[model samples]
Target: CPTECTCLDTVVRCSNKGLKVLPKGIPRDVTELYLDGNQFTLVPKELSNYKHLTLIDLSNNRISTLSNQSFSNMTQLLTLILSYNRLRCIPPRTFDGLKSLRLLSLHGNDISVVPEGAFNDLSALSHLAIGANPLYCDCNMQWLSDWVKSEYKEPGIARCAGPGEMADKLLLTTPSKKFTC
Candidate 1:
């Protein structure tokens, strides 16, 4: 047990520990990991070693970018909470190996464009919380609007934050013709 964290069975709570790096000596089989409200500017690459992690909370941090395949080995990860960060864009393939991920929260960031095909690999994703950020709804975002209409069944909350006329409009209900290059 790391003296700075609390370990209860399979869950580890390290929230608000002022941690800039992942703490060492976490239980090898931890299923849930909470490292929120810290000073991390990037997702720790060492997290990939925890294969049994099912839920990871890194919200309210300073994460701005994600390296490709950052969670490659975390095949069992079911929920990823990344809200309230400094993310500007989600690079395609950033979530390449999360085959079982079902919930991905990216709300309350500084995102402007979620590059096309950013969420294509998430086959099991049912809930995507991407509201509360500045999203540019242009031709480049057509795929996202289309995806929400065709594949996304949940009540969408993502709204447009640009192009003047399209501002504040719901991304899910916006017509395709409105998205012009």
Candidate 2:
């Protein structure tokens, strides 16, 4: 026990701890880990050790970047919350092996572009929250907007709030004819 966290059965609650780094000694069998309201700058690689982990709440942190292989090994991850972070970009294959992932929250981040195939490997994704980001809304985001229209049927939810030309525009409604490299 790290005193700031409480471990019960298969859950670890470490929210509101004001911690700057990932806490140590978390049981590997834990299924849910909540580290929201902290200052972790990156997704802790130690989370890969939890083979049964289904949900991880890392929202409300200050994470600015993630390694390409950050969650490549969390094959069973179902819900990953990374909202309200400082992430400016996502490396390719960031969610590589998360085959069971259903929800990915990236709301309120500094992300401007995500690789076209960043979420391609996630075959089971049911809901994605990428709203409120500083998306570029250019050809770089064409893939995302198209995906949103196809999956959610509402492109306004993936509103682009930046780049001057695309500000306040629903990315999915942005005519591709106007997108030039």
Candidate 3:
């Protein structure tokens, strides 16, 4: 239901399929997209127009690269699920247009590096989860760690089940990774 046909004014379940790309012109009002467990190598076009989208499930996909313009024009999105993808690096401004994002899940991915100031532009972010990602345990996490620390909030996030699982709540301990980069 994702890369093909059009469904209107409702929830669309395109999950667990071997999809390579998302279909174009999927209305911006159709909320609840189930793109999890697909074959999306990158953020396909036309899927970002969901002005009323609240939940997006992209878990278990093949996405390794994310463009800065991927989430443009989306102001009502609350929950974004990108777990189990193959992400290694992200553009510092990848979340540029997500102004009202409340929950973001990047768990179970291969992300080892996140640029400094990766989340400095997120104005309405509350719950952020980069768990299960292969944290390189280096000095680069201070930027993200520091941002989360500054905010005194509780995020109902999924824990990292990978080798970094030990940092489940530890990552949220001080919000700051302790060591300044």
Top candidate, metric lDDT: 1
Instruction: Give the local distance difference test score of model 2.
Output: 0.82
Off by over 4 Å in 2: 153-155, 162-165, 172-179
Q: lDDT, candidate 3, residue 18?
A: 70
If ranked by lDDT, best first, what sequence of candidates would result?
1, 2, 3
Q: Kindly list the per-residue Cα lDDT of model 2 for residues 1-181, writing each as its tens digit.
A: 5578999988999998899877788887889999999988888877887788999999999999999778868888999999899999789889888899988999889988888999888888878887778777677777777677666734366677666677787766776544445
Of 1 and 3, the candidate ranking higher by TM-score: 1
Q: Over the stretch 100-161, how does candidate 1's per-residue lDDT look in tens digits?
A: 99999998999878888787778888878888888898999888787778667336678889
TM-score for model 1? 0.94
After the best TM-score superposition of candidate 2, give how far the Cα of residue 11 lies from its true spot, in angstroms.
1.3
Candidate 2: Cα lDDT at 64: 93
Error of 2 at 107 (Å): 0.2
TM-score of each: 0.94, 0.90, 0.78
lDDT of 3 by residue, 1-181 (tens): 3455446557777766677877555665677887877888887656666667778888888888898887767777777888888988888888776777878888778876778877665678877777666565445765565666557433534232223433444445544444333
